[PDB]
Design a binder for this molecule. Structure first.
Ligand SMILES: [Zn+2]
Ligand SMILES: [Zn+2]
Ligand SMILES: [Zn+2]
Ligand SMILES: [Zn+2]
Lengths: 201, 200, 201, 200
DNA sequence: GAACATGTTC
DNA sequence: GAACATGTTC
DNA sequence: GAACATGTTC
DNA sequence: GAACATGTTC
């Protein structure tokens, strides 16, 4: 019933938080997060872990969904999916059990459920909430992004926000955050160029 | 011929391959370099070539255009439309040609789009038609349906377009070839290649 | 139910400890431990003993598991196994009764049980806990690592953490530690180069 | 012939073995040293050779390529793909050649991959095909499927590739050979060997 | 990772 | 069309 | 164990 | 492509 996915930050009754672990300080590493820009620069198809933190545990069976959305108004109503070349190629989709049309995957979780909504057409991925590891702060989730932002046919050169929601089994939203995501072959240089440009300006 | 011959060959008939004066302007959708024997065109933008012949003979002769990757090492790969273009709609929808084909003909509606069962090679064949009364030579209007840059098709692997005049039985009569480059800026690209050529 | 093996240090209710006996001070010896880096440099296929110490004895039938895991996020979900050339070659697997696909073996224990998990696919080796030798501090376990870190097909050039867990018969974790493991043909030089580099930097 | 003859021999037909100009560039996937009579190629990267003949005779003649270790002392060992490559998927999956074979042919789909029952030797045979109309010589596109450095295959034991022109019955007509080196940097390796050659 | 490719933006 | 934007070669 | 091999990294 | 990384020869 939500043809515009909500994008606005919502700290839940549980202060829901999404953060990133030791991103490279090097241009080298395949993913990096700009705290300044609230932006993730990642590389196509590579593992990209996030940290969720909450102030109190949610009820059992609570889940965490990741749903990509186009940021610009003329694109906001366009469902974000894999470009046809990636969707129908050989490279990743055939081994994996996740559906080929999906942009966002989860690594290492076998309760992950890949959702295509019949009414809204939105593509998303859900995992059950797990409390952190014993004596730790954060619950880590491993994502894989399956097109570059640059990919034609797919989300071509349009910028996307990644919405992470904490949800009850009902679907009821208990928390929500988002950040801009960029998938490309040079996340360190791109991060610097954007940061340099933002600061110049 | 699992790998098609590419070096030039003339026929029984003068078999000329030419290009109308390309604009020397950057504002032209296509332009040809006599220097490099290279054609610069824009994706999906009709580009005319001139074949000219001296005799009109055999009763079912045809002319085919077949792209092949130029480097020996990429040469056994069939040149096709990238999946992204193949499956998109912008040009795929409404015409009478297979979406997987890189090369189309626009004027002839008796164009035959050929897929070799053994080699998988894709080419486009048209019947020879004598020129229009009072025009000197018959023109063939091609459409190139991916940029060379195209992703999952040819990725930035230069291609040579072989045009051959053929009898009904397949015997090769005339054949020529040139390197083809499909991009969004053929005039600038032409200029860079010719510059990077005189000294380099 | 643990597609990401826990890697975090856990001193159990028994202060569980994993240490190393007289590693060579020489470049010569086939294995060596860097206390600085928490890293074991060992040589392919050679005996590599460890010392476990506990502050109180655990209950009877407690076991000790060794499970290799890739350290880097994009590799973390990849099961660590022997490279095909080692797995299917003549050299060690045929004499030994341990399964050829396993990276980590135990020497000299006939209750060692080599586990391939049907749900998670993880490869590990378990032995029953033994109190130390009379009048001694530590219980020694003899491991054999069956690929170099450098081995292509196998864990090729990716770094691995070795997780040693103290476990009840149930599987319940009573203690856990880990260290980075490196298997190569020159552990002394490599140790020095890494130590030299860490200290420079 | 449990151990195959390796020294060069010519045939009834001019039997030339050549290489298209290799780039003198480091950026080429392969390059050949006329000096050492050594071919430097990259793993799995198609590399063309030129056989040329003067007469096209016998009705079922073929041309085989068979790798052999060059040192006398390693010579009785069959040259094969390392188990790591044999069992991996990256190239093993989707084509029509046994994974254990080091040498493949890419253009011919009538390639016959031979495993000698007595010697266990592996080679690849193709039928002689006359050149393409107007091209001068038929090209054969090889693929080398391990680096020489490859682990459990040839470990850093240099190999000589023997190419022989053969009648249907097996009688040896022409044969030549050269040393082959498969690695991730053929241009640099070429340069080091030729340098370590002029003075040393 | 610097320099280069090439398509889009304005 | 210059200037900017992105994946790729070296 | 120093010098050399050779493949990867950036 | 230079510089770094690893198993192997001597
Ligand atoms: Zn894509
Ligand atoms: Zn295309
Ligand atoms: Zn191994
Ligand atoms: Zn190999």
């Amino acid at each position: 019933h939500e043809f515009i996915p909500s994008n606005t930050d919502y700290p839940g009754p549980h202060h829901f938080e999404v953060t990133f672990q030791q991103s490279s300080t090097a241009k080298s590493a395949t993913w990096t997060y700009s705290p300044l820009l609230k932006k993730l620069y990642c590389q196509i198809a590579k593992t990209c872990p996030i940290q969720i933190k909450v102030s109190t545990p949610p009820p059992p069976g609570t889940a965490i969904r990741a749903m990509p959305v186009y940021k610009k108004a003329e694109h906001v109503t366009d469902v974000v999916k894999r470009c046809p070349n990636h969707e129908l190629g050989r490279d990743f989709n055939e081994g994996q059990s996740a559906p080929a049309s999906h942009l966002i995957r989860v690594e290492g979780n076998n309760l992950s459920q890949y959702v295509d909504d019949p009414v809204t057409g939105r593509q998303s991925v859900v995992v059950p909430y797990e409390p952190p590891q014993v004596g730790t702060e954060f619950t880590t989730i491993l994502y894989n992004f399956m097109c570059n932002s640059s990919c034609v046919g797919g989300m071509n050169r349009r910028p996307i926000l990644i919405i992470i929601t904490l949800e009850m089994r009902d679907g009821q939203v208990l928390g929500r955050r988002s950040f801009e995501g960029r998938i490309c072959a040079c996340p360190g240089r791109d991060r610097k160029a954007d940061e340099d440009h933002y600061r110049e300006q």
